[PDB]
Structures are given as structure tokens and as C-alpha cells.
Design a protein around this ligand. Structure first.
Ligand SMILES: [Ca+2]
Ligand SMILES: [Ca+2]
Length: 312
């Protein structure tokens, strides 16, 4: 498999558990530090990074009834400039740029207690697909599905429903949605970290997935595996292979990676394209830092880059 070694430029550092890189509608950049702790307890943070100087500012340190969060993944909303954040302790949060936030759900559509979330992906219809590798949210004692298959997948719909769409995953992590050229969501990709697999489903409609299949295989026998992921504009899927020192590049049909991107660190955790550019920002856990490098083409537009109105 061909391997390219683009130049990685440092963006910022000292971000415990650096994760969930995301750009909002104004082009501002944010990341999360899920592993920040106080007295051994969760005190995860959501930060804004001024791309010039690299100055960091903690805009939100989420806590619900004394329980600190472990913010791990983000997606920017389209109709409002607010961030949807997957939190391993608090579930799904909606965070404002001013730092205020709200807890979206303590229970799902079936009345079952909500599980801690890791990453999420908005499809163009505005539905949010979420991975939930943790056990029940706070105040329940914290648990993760790295050993046991109790990780779930949710779809938070436009009509406000938190619907569990699948279960029994061994640490579902990265997630992405593939769209037809006309914008219709039709495939959901989910990373199952320790099993070194990428699963796919046909998206038949909001919160409706079927035909679960082992879509891709993550290289290596190292500890770790697929973490965060995103599509480029040609629908190639770039996947951070935590512990492999590489970001894997899958073609539209999956299978084995068609190319690998060598990183100057062993633990890439997540990535995100800067709108209208070939620049990919990468978070990593070897140095708990953020970097950027130039990919071969622009990224696939995120939901926040699409227009609710307009004509085309
Ligand atoms: Ca993740
Ligand atoms: Ca991303």
C-alpha cells in the first residue's frame, strides 16, 4: 500500500486526550480535551484555538450535578452556530460559543438510560449519528466497551428523538456518513476500534439503518485501531489508526486502505478538514497535541457548510 509523508505543522499542544477537532460556521477552530482531571475525577474541556499564535481558551468545562464530562467528539450545527458534543460521561451536549451548554438526553426514545458518547456525524438531512462506547451516563459509574460488547449507536433526529439504532459493539468510535452526489444520505460507516474493523450500514431514512456489513479492515495488530474519521470530497475515507502512526485512506468501496499517511507520532486520534481547503487538522495522543497537513484535495463538506435555503 502506497504511503505518503506530508509535512505536519504544529498547531497547539498540551491538550490532554486531544480529540474532536471541528470548525464552526465562522471558521473558528475547536478541540476537546476529554482527559483533563481534577482530584482524579473527570473535568474534560472544550477549547477554542486561535489558529494564529496557537493560543488556547477553555470555553466550556461541562459538568452536570457535580459530574464532570469527558467531551470527546464534535460536529457543528447548520442552522445555528453551536456545537454538538459527544461526551463519554454526559452523553450528547449542545455547546454555545459563549461557553454555555445543555444536556440533550438522560434517556433514549425507549426510556432506556443514555450511554456515554464518543463521536458523531451529521448527515445532510440534519440527523446526527452517534457512537456510544461508554456505559450509562453519569451518575452511573463509568464503564467502557473495550472488552465487552455493550457499545451502541444512536441517531438524534431533527424531530428531537434520541434513537438507539444498534448495539453490541466493542467500542464504536469514529463515525461518518456517505452521501449520494445529490446529497441523499445512504451509507453510515462506524469504526469498532479493537476489532480493527469499519462497519457499514445502508441508511434508508432518518434513524433507519440496515444491512450491517464489515466494510473495511484496519491494518496492524497493535493496541488500538480506528478512532476518528472523515470523507474527502471524492468520498475517500480518512481514518486515524490510533497506535499505527498512520491515517488510513479508504477508497469509496472500502476493503483495505488504498493509501496510508504517515504521521510523526504513533497515536493519531481524530482529524477534521478546514472548510474550502485541503488542510486536515489532526489531534494525537503521543504528545497530546494538534497538527495540520495538506491532503490531496478538499474535504467533503460538513453539514454546517451546507445551506438550509438557497437554490442549489
Ligand atoms: Ca474518538
Ligand atoms: Ca472530524
Amino acid at each position: 500500500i502506497p504511503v505518503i509523508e506530508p509535512l505536519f505543522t504544529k498547531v497547539t499542544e498540551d491538550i490532554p486526550g486531544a480529540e474532536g477537532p471541528v470548525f464552526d460556521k465562522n471558521g473558528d477552530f475547536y478541540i476537546v480535551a476529554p482527559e483533563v482531571e481534577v482530584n482524579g475525577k473527570p473535568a474534560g474541556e472544550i477549547l477554542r484555538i486561535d489558529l494564529k499564535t496557537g493560543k488556547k481558551t477553555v470555553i466550556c468545562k461541562p459538568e452536570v450535578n457535580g459530574y464532570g464530562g469527558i467531551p470527546a467528539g464534535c460536529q457543528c450545527d447548520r442552522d445555528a452556530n453551536q456545537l454538538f458534543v459527544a461526551d463519554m460521561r454526559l452523553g450528547l451536549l449542545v455547546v454555545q460559543t459563549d461557553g454555555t451548554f445543555e444536556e440533550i438526553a438522560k434517556k433514549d426514545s425507549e426510556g432506556r438510560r443514555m450511554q456515554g458518547c464518543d463521536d458523531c456525524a451529521f448527515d445532510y438531512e440534519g440527523n446526527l449519528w452517534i457512537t456510544a462506547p461508554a456505559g450509562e451516563v453519569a451518575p452511573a459509574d463509568y464503564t467502557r466497551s473495550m472488552q465487552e460488547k455493550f457499545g451502541s449507536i444512536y441517531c438524534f433526529t431533527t424531530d428531537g428523538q434520541m434513537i438507539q439504532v444498534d448495539t453490541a459493539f466493542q467500542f464504536p468510535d469514529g463515525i461518518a456518513v456517505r452521501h449520494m452526489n445529490d446529497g441523499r444520505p445512504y451509507q453510515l460507516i462506524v469504526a469498532e476500534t479493537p476489532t480493527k474493523k469499519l462497519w457499514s450500514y445502508d441508511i434508508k431514512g432518518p434513524a433507519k439503518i440496515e444491512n450491517k456489513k464489515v466494510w473495511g479492515h484496519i491494518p496492524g495488530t497493535h493496541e488500538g485501531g480506528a478512532n476518528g474519521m472523515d470523507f474527502d470530497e471524492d468520498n475517500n475515507l480518512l481514518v486515524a489508526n490510533w497506535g499505527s502512526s498512520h491515517i488510513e485512506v479508504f477508497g469509496p468501496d472500502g476493503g483495505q486502505p488504498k493509501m496510508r499517511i504517515r504521521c510523526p507520532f504513533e497515536k493519531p486520534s481524530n482529524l477534521h478538514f478546514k472548510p474550502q481547503t485541503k488542510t486536515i487538522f489532526v489531534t494525537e495522543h503521543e504528545n497530546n497535541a494538534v497538527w495540520k497537513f495538506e491532503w490531496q484535495r478538499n474535504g467533503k463538506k460538513q453539514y454546517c457548510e451546507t445551506l438550509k435555503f438557497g437554490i442549489f
